[model samples]
Target: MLNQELELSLNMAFARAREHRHEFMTVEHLLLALLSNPSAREALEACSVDLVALRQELEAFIEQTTPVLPASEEERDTQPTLSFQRVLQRAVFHVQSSGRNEVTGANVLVAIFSEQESQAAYLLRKHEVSRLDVVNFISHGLENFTTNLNQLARVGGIDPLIGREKELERAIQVLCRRRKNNPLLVGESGVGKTAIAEGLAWRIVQGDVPEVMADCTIYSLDIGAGTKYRGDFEKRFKALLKQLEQDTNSILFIDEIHTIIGAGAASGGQVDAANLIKPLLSSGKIRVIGSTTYQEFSNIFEKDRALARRFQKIDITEPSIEETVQIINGLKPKYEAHHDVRYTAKAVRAAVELAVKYINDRHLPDKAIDVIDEAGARARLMPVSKRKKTVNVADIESVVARIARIPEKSVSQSDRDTLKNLGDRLKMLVFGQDKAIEALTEAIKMARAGLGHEHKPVGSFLFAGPTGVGKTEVTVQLSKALGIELLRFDMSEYMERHTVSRLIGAPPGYVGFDQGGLLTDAVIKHPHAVLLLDEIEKAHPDVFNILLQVMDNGTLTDNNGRKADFRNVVLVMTTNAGVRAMEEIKKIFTPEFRNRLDNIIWFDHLSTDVIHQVVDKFIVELQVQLDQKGVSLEVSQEARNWLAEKGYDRAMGARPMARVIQDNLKKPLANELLFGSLVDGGQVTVALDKEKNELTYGFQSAQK
Candidate 1:
């Protein structure tokens, strides 16, 4: 149905066309109507086009050159030309797919450009307007402020806000007060402080407030966002303040408002953003809604004497699970429509719980909604044939699985299930280290089961054994068996005093002082994962202090004062801690530096009995590889005994067993696999021959 406003503009074109007795309502006739038409008039005149000038051009050509109808056939109803209907059809299509209530002037104007060769399109362009400039023009802008949430609230540009009525209510209360009227929102990142401000705009517009807030207009100033040249910031900043101070309605919302402290003098000038706003905030000349983290609030207000007391503090806490679910459910409709799928109630619950449980270093509601949005996005991300009608709990779990860098299967196997079977699982892969494996799992089991120190890591263990005695092997299989991440660091590389900065972050003088340390950043990203530090003794003595602080407090702070929580991390360090010369080892590790370990687990040499088992395990792995070549392998019990004796070493442990297989078995197979009877595929049996000291192979028939 054509709107009343639409047809009111429609009358202008048809009246002119009939008056001229034009046979057809062609593209040129439509151009004449675009200037006179109200639906077209709003957007066309936005670019300062000479309306009378453009209207005259279209009329002169229409009457002089256009097809004429006879005066006797005055009753002949004029019809639209093909391209004329095409523009109107395409205009409705744009508004249909897009978010619109009607085919407005902008929609019709955009569609008219499809007929690029037509004067109807050229007339707009010839008046010095590009399609690109329309994005800026149509949305409406003050240029300096990126967006105004007040109008945005009325325009429905923002998504639905689920919770935060309390924050919204308090925000307005603070705005209505005298002197300290401006609110300084103190929150952990991603707890929806910005959304609270957005909700304030929604609250004021949706209903009434104390009539003072009726005319209040909040504009978000992206303070010093891209001001690179000198004096540019002051000029632009001064212009905004001039514009804002003239009206009491202007309010500013700065997201991550901590950056405003430095915005005043980026070109090494004396005044900064906070410097100029100090007086405005104090006198109530300028109203502002500033949001930043709790850490930044202290960093800004404390150790400051100026405008610190001018703004009121409003602490925003993370929403609980139930409230977060409510938030996600309230916002669920938009994401469902966006991805073209319905969200199950369980999907909403899972998104809240999973984001809260797994996503560390961030607060809830914001992250929860993200997982909810991404979960809906995932099903649609698949092929069109695979697109589902509804997103479920499984999709949200998978979304946060990748979000937190955890494996999919890792979540299915819960902590209780993983820890209960960890020792048994390790016994299979790492032989003769059941005592070490038992101690390792015992600490984690008791700790994860809730009977150990809460401040320390999940369980901090130091592996005390020579190189390759399954010290590092246990670290790897633990990551696999527990289904968690393994962040392994080669400590030998950081043996010097200088590189400790690389782990704990470089001190103030270094180049990357702000980038933070590697261990701190990794633990921050995946705090619940494993921390494997290899050859711990090879690292500088300063590293022990770093580990000591982490083990004691379960938190490691970087140079910039950002502390990374290590509460749930399983910290593992490998070293020859208990090997030869016990007294000399004590010199390097004092009781103070060394006594913090939860378990100083020992890895001893493999017994010959265990060595044979290791040989068997290795042989099976080789058989699996050879099976791909259509070749099978069988190792006799006697051959296993001989290999165990050859590979076994008390000092090096059973680390030589791999070399034994590589030298005797794979080396021979390497030539045979590419050239000998094994090429087409065959079976081979290994047995201790009559020499009794050597092994020989009995070859079966080749497949060819």
Candidate 2:
């Protein structure tokens, strides 16, 4: 039977190659072997990457790149290179010469080297990856990899963090049942979905799984890179297809499964790919593991009811900020060893801050990691000038400068002292709304003290009241006080009527494309930052699907089936959903959504006195920066009251207050920065001019 499985797979490869009149087996052939291997599929069933999609990916690679003869060594002296085809041909030659009936990754790698030694060396050295290694690694499940990813804390090694433990355990159980069904791991990009699959295999191999679990193998196929033509791609494809006949205890893992969405369309002829994957998954013939962003999965493959129902679902999510701290702490020893410098807790905090900023500005944790990595690298390059072994504030600054790609911004010690004073002055910025202040202040205090809230309390808030109240400003103030950055997305962006998957990623049909959420990416990087889903009432019902999960778990999964940890986050959803009767009672009742929400705070419509107070505070802050330029402003206290009252009448709550202040200050601030002359005893007078709805400020040359 083993011989038959091998022969059939080889014949499939041969037939596929022969159909295209290709010379030998290719990587696609290898992929087909792994993809069709029953053992591999069984293992991967927990993760949801099916055989048909695997074949489709291999086919695409063949169609895109054809095999050609290797470049001559003479050409190496000039400006020449080998095409992907040439590399394939050499790989085939190596395999054939070695007397191996089937092409192993080692043979393919030798071919690459024989075809072009320099390029082979370059790929290995630069990417820290090996073609052979990829072939071997994917051919089997994640068994051969090193790294203990599940340790909870810093225990002298790097441990992977963020979501998927429950999912992995469930996958293990499914595999233990040895059922033909496959499951899918879905979540956002940074939440460690792939790692979970890898971790699963590692645990199983270590015999760490429960005794109920049998020994199983997992084979990961990154569908994104699965399709490639080393030889006659068609022949290579068939070979891979025949693999299912063997290895019943194996699992197949496919990451970035969104690739299958466009597989079989006639226009691009990509429809065949999706058609291919559907059969294997639906038949319960092969257990498949698939991963992708949520949006693509919903809109493409999974949208079809038939396609959506094939696999069981497993959700992976991002880890909590406290978890992130743990992850960083665990990785610290390695990082220090790599950079030859000890990182202080403050240095780690600085790194975390940079990561949060990037996470907010860019919807990518990959970018966040880059920032952290570059910062650490810079600390290594900087000269040690009398500081201790531990990385200090200067190292943090240096790291920041490297990441920003510009000269460092130096705030004088006195300038920081002044900002500290400003922070103190703003402490009693507003009164009577002690609860709002307390919520904002608590978030700041938590950040400063590094008191990562581990209790998983329901920290989300429903800030309900009339529009123009102070619901959102609290987010900005909290950010400033905590010295972290803030990011905001409107919930209305997600409410598109009936689409459930739009909020996540791939609607429902495609493989593993279930990782996305406005909140997921934001929290992945910032982790602890405030997420204000502005106008929550306007969001689609599907948007609330996460509310139940998030409120209960303080964690949610993204499209890629990864976890998004919100334990450190203070979720503040502002709404005007039910506030009409609020004014009559002097206290407002929150909307039904508040039932699932906690820390629901109400912001009352601003009274004239409150508006006046806010305006006065704004004016004072403006004066301080201007004073540094030797510029002074004088305004009647009556004018401040009048402006505050006007703003209050026109305000939509707290939303429009800043706009009014900014609109009045723009011209004056611009003049101060540009043409204003403050020398020679000049007097600058700042005033509100209603004629053009502008502020006119003139600086006279200093009176001599």
Candidate 3:
């Protein structure tokens, strides 16, 4: 009501006014001046005083009376001796200087009486404002004040996906009907339980929920780690609750309420969080929304029976994959202009698939976020020249792989060169999975071109077929070619849900939970090494979820909230997911889930022809190595086919052929060699036994 200039003057006037002897300003003349003087309005406003009606009533009375007054000595003179204002000022100063300036409305009346004898009795007899008038005025003013304050206010929602319109309505009904206390919101992580309580507050505050809306006020309680305080606690708490009563509708949101039982309860058995809140809850003094995670509410908080009984639990579950996809899709545009790169539908799909897989796997949400973040980082690092104008299928595949592949092991220059030569030799002998190779190439290209995939990799794969199929061998070859050592995570370790932390760090609350986990550490130390997450399906749900973000985004953010980039590394996740299924079909079919794979291809089961071909290559290579050592070994054509025939019955597919050939001539070679091991200038002989079908391994001594 007070503009800047008027407000400032009123502040000064109110101070000066308080100094007056009479604490209350109550005179028709005083009210008259206040209503007339613009500054007096703000002064009256500041002190919860009202001068308007007082002025109106006095004016009306004066108009009706039309009382006449006797002329003073000065007034009787031909001209006025002094102005009326100076006369009034002198009178005021005389009254104040009397040391009784606590000028009440009665004092104003007396002053007016002294100035005019005929009006004195009329003015003195008038009654002043009553206590009821003060109450009515203040109450009406407050109502208008609150209403105007809310006009431009903006209300924000919590966890937007946590929709429980019905449940919230039901909770309100219970509060309205039974006057229940501590209605608890119970659910798994990511299920949106906390959001429900927050949403209720949002609706109430926004006036979307009309019933008891005027009473709604939300006070959030943080009952973190531990509790320590003294006697003022109860008094402070009671005062807060009393404040809550001022609102027409209010729900106190106490998140992580489970802490009330353990950490927040008390000091030295003197007090407890549960006990402290119990009186408020049981008395039906206020509505409360209690949010807690499963580990805390059930395992920790539920230990106290009294506290548990106080709450009526409502469970909320995480949405399904489709629901997650929709949620992310809805949230996608929110990132576009703000993030370094716009997420194409392909990127979204890739990211959603990662979230689904991680959720399905039961990893934490951080895992999924880690992936998206990595991809975003990579996208930012990428040169604009290399940025894709549109996300094509190839772009998607490359990005997916880039996000997926673990790095090769750390290596020095000389070791790397030797490994590269070895890898080249191995690759020359093997074929297939050229697309996987191309994906790797693309990752390198993206890295070099500064077109790194902006997402963490879930894991990449290379499919190799049959016995001597080169699947595992190719990984070994890759390690050599990349000049990085190899570190592998045994997916079997993660098969048990409880053991999933072996992949991420240990679960929170466990010892060393903050330290790097097995897979995570390998990646962190050797960001460019071949880190394998083998038999990924065998990994626990928690571990799977952990991959959700990293796989699509290419960065594994650790439990400590640190992001470790995999953009410079290669990652491989292998699974025999479709092998047995394909064998059942007697042909092959890509697994249904492979639709999410960056580069999925089936390795054909070994045939006799492929086996025979592998044997021929092995023998020819052995001859070259043997010749270098001045030793000669030859596998007869008949011997190669014999190995091929043995490959057929091995249901494990092409995995068995290399070892089978080693057995063909072991005895004869062991006997011909002069020394136990091969060295420079060594000579040895190899001969296959037709009757026993045996091979012996031995090396000749070096020749002088």
Candidate 4:
């Protein structure tokens, strides 16, 4: 049985001969019918056979050979010519031999090419479609692993590009060149390298490109998806290039094009995909458009000078904020329709702003688009009764905050209040550090208000104080008070010069290359966080150089060539160098590095009164912890006085009090709980025996 599509196509061929008043159905009539069928036409077009030229050629040949005359209605239903019958028979035979159940359009295409004496076969060869090529097309679907991007664009499967006209034009210009015509797109991921290639296809569909590219079809060769066997890749890719070499109207587009360098290589001796395509590239036998990141281009193609010289490089940088905004606006309708919601202009702007600030792992436009897309989905997913028809800026902010794990001040009232009273909150937790708190609060406020330098961290500070003076405590308290994440790195751990790699990443070919750097990974995962470098003076000198880059440029390129952004981070460095801190800083740190710091706030030593206040605060926190366990705690004034004196130290500041209380109160309470002396809903009192200068615990039921 014939495939329904093919049977209908053959019927149309007979009707075409009758419409011309011809007595017999010739090969020319069959050619006209195949052109009329969509699937058949696609098979021919995919092979770079110019259907228009072939149609004209067949029409001219038919006019010279066939005589036009009025035929009887009986003769109009006459049989096809001998050549047409033989072609159909051969098509059926091929279909059966190939084990296909039905005769498809591909089978008929093979039949036409097999009949070398027919005019249809001559027309096929004139367009550069050989019989073996048709066999390959029939044996395998036309160009395996290669998708017709122009066909996809024709069906509106691609998004409209905004502000990439210059890049697209340059790509077209390179594609139109004679030698080294392949355009290699080098850009960071998500900067629209693939989009530029699809954009070229869309332009070709709209007839916006030059005449030479008007009839060109772009096939995106997905290399990785096709390499199932050791040599299957080379076989398919080589055949594709061979076909493309003969068809001038075919252009191949490969995304992540650097994969071709070592693809399909084995321990034995498998030729790489790049070497297979290299000779064709050198001969200018195929037109290709390739896309890859700048790092890959440098690491792969640049090393192979032969491959590097065969391509024209096109650098695609990320779009500016305004351009990204325009891109979001242009893509707004697609996301809106997809999520069944509308996006407000404010939402679009917020998406771009928040993505740039919090989504630093990705490039602009793509991240901005994702923000809006997810925002719409987030809004739509709310309870049906509570969902808004339009996604607002707050919705967008909430989405960004959820994905980036940062606080959404625009959508969260508590976050805004926290930022407003940041200093007060920190002061409540950390005592005797009002000066440091105030300085940090102002810096954070300026940063949150968007008043800080656009390309630098939110604030970079040097906190210098003796041990136990709340140098590191301020950072912890500020982290919680500002509602930001804390990424603390003890500089003592990074004391060696090679330890610097632990912060950024190991060099290539080293261990732990895949895991990324500690600091870089942390910041990338949580960009809007407090980066605490405790005892910064203890770190290796090389560590300081790495920090200088992040502090000055707001970016650090890790071992993987990914730039970690610090623009949204609060950089705080604590050192116990005390009075010599500035001297050491000046001698060890370059003036440029020292000047990049927003402030060098010194934490003051805890005084007697401040220490007493700190002790009270600690006791209150201990009381809260007991409250969670359904137990109440009471301490006597004598006990408070005893604890204040015992925990205070001129050099250690308020830190000793925590341990003193832990030993005196927490340890005793835990022992009592373990022995069943203290139970839930019980009251525990701590009193100081003035004569012995010791703490005593008194436990009883709260009801009693």
Q: How many clashes show up per model?
A: 2, 106, 68, 0
How would you encode candidate 1's per-residue C-alpha lDDT over 1-704 as one tens digit per residue? 44566665567777756654467887777666666556466666677777764664465445434555644644666778888888888878877776776766566667777788887677667666667655556567247455788889876677656657787778888988876878988888788888888878776775546788888887887653224555466566666666677746768787766554522225532235445654554333778788867766685444443245767889899999987876665555456556777665556678888888888756798888778777766776587524343446777778888888632232335766767888898999988878898988888777765677656888888777765578888888888887778887877666654455356744343313212467788888887789998888777666777788888989887734467888878888888756735565567667886688887777776667777778988998999998987899998888888888888777777778889998877887776778887888998888888565998877764763
lDDT, candidate 1, at 468 = 57
How well is each residue in 1-704 modelled by candidate 2, as lDDT tens digits? 12345345546666655434343455444444444544334433434435443443344444323232223554211111235456546656655665656544334444443433443334333324445444454345422333223331113132333334677778776555544356667766776667677767657655658865444556665344124434443544334434642535456666665554422322322334333543464333445666755555565557643244555666665555544544555445445555665555555556666656534423233433454566567654548523234346466566555555442222556434534453343345653356566654454344334444343532677777676666666666655654555757676555564356556543342211213545677678787566667887766555676666777777776644446876666677887776636453233333545575556676666766677778877777877866776666666665575457556654365455566667665455565457656542345565666555445566665442
lDDT per residue (tens digit) for residues 414-466 in model 3: 64454345434553655544444455544443443334454544235535334
User: Model 4, which residues run further than 4 Å from truth?
Assistant: 1-146, 149-218, 223-251, 259-289, 293-295, 304-416, 498-516, 559-561, 579-588, 628-630, 645-652, 689-693, 701-704
Q: Is candidate 1 or candidate 3 better by TM-score?
A: 1
Q: How many clashes does the backbone of model 4 have?
A: 0
- Candidate number that wins on lDDT, 3 or 4: 4
Ranking by lDDT: 4, 1, 2, 3
Candidate 1 local Cα displacement, residue 353, angstroms? 24
Worst 10 residues of 4 by lDDT: 506-515
lDDT of all the models against the reference? Answer: 0.72, 0.53, 0.50, 0.75
TM-score on alpha carbons, each prediction: 0.49, 0.41, 0.36, 0.54
Candidate 1 ranges with C-alpha deviation above 4 Å = 1-251, 259-294, 297-421, 496-515, 558-563, 580-587, 593-595, 627-630, 635-651, 685-700
Per-residue accuracy of model 4 over 433-497 as CA lDDT, tens digit each: 78888988888877777576767999999988777878787888778776689998877666654
Of 2 and 4, the candidate ahead on TM-score is: 4
